[PDB]
């Protein structure tokens, strides 16, 4: 909802400046609202194109490289907190596990999602279970990699 436009006077319309604008570029007409497009087109303006160029230095500053942002990756989280989380995560899988035991009994045709809903378990009980381990595995796995590395490096 950003367009570049050009003025339509009585003089401009008589000359036929409005088609003249589309020429020399990729061409662009607006969209937002029905009343604003018909009204705008006749009285207010003719529409023309905006394209964007931003250099690699501009992209580098755009990105916001940040010092703490990378540092966190190494920063070790509590051991008790991983154990606690491991136990919490298992508790979500338990819920899903009742639905999951029933879903697995018959899945002898095609499409896992249909089978899973049919023999009880909304969408995919397998998926829910898997996402739940993945988040815990991700935090524990990186922290272990980081911990062993830091202890040796600093010492």
């Amino acid at each position: 909802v950003i367009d570049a436009f050009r003025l339509i006077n009585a003089n401009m319309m008589v000359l036929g400046h409005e088609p003249r604008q589309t020429t020399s570029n990729l061409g662009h007409l607006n969209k937002p609202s029905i009343q604003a497009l018909i009204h705008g087109l006749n009285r207010h303006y003719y529409s023309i194109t905006i394209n964007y160029r931003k250099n690699e230095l501009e992209q580098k500053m755009l990105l916001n490289l940040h010092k703490k942002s990378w540092m966190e990756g190494l920063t070790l989280q509590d051991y008790s907190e991983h154990c606690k989380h491991n136990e919490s995560v298992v508790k979500e899988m338990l819920e899903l596990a009742k639905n999951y035991n029933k879903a697995v009994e018959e899945e002898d045709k095609m499409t896992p999602e249909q089978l899973a809903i049919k023999n009880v378990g909304k969408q995919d009980p397998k998926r829910h279970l898997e996402e739940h381990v993945d988040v815990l595995m991700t935090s524990n796995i990186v922290q272990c990699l980081a911990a062993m590395l830091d202890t040796v490096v600093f010492k």
Partner: protein, 117 residues
């Protein structure tokens, strides 16, 4: 079968003199071997016990016999011996402070996991 079992008292050498078809000359070098085996097992057996209790089971009773096989074992002097070496090996499971090796396969498990997701 008897040596494997761990018996050094129903092993036989008398049944190897029933054939005298030159099996009679092998026994000569199999009275060495029985001795060797008792001795190794004793290294594993004791964390440390008295010299007196261990010599009667070796079937050594002269210090010369003690010295001879002690060299092979790595045991130092004759009546004195260090049965203890073998026992010492069990104990390191206690450590936890150096994580990298102790945890094990830290690199391996991570790499495969990263591919999968």
């Amino acid at each position: 079968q008897y040596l494997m079992e761990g018996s050094y008292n129903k092993v036989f050498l008398a049944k190897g003199n029933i054939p005298a078809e030159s099996y009679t000359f092998f026994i000569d070098i199999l009275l060495d071997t029985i001795r060797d085996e008792i001795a190794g097992c004793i290294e594993k057996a004791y964390e440390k016990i008295l010299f007196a209790e261990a010599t009667r089971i070796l079937f050594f009773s002269t210090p010369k016999k003690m010295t001879d096989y002690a060299k092979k074992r790595g045991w130092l002097l004759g009546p004195n011996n260090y049965y203890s070496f073998a026992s010492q090996q069990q104990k390191p499971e206690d450590s936890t402070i150096p994580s990298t090796e102790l945890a094990r396969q830290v690199i391996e498990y991570a790499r495969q996991l990263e591919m999968i997701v």
